């Protein structure tokens, strides 16, 4: 399964893809970095084309 992900809170919003086995394993290692990178305002989830997104 494919999984994208989409950060916005800096000057421009960042950008990932990553295809894993399944959602979940993918579905962590996202939120790992994901968390680590910039997080703070709303955490948005796309469930069309499983991809992970934290606007400002």
Do not use: R
């Not at 399964?1 to 950008?15: D, P, R, S, V």
């Not at 893809?17 to 990178?37: C, M, P, Q, R």
Request: proline share 0%; glycine share 4%; hydrophobic share 40%.
């Amino acid at each position: 399964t494919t999984y994208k992900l989409i950060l916005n809170l800096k000057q421009a919003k960042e950008e990932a893809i990553k295809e894993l086995v399944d959602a979940g394993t993918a579905e962590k290692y996202f939120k790992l970095i994901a968390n680590a990178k910039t997080v703070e305002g709303v955490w948005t989830y796309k469930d069309e084309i499983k991809t992970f997104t934290v606007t400002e």
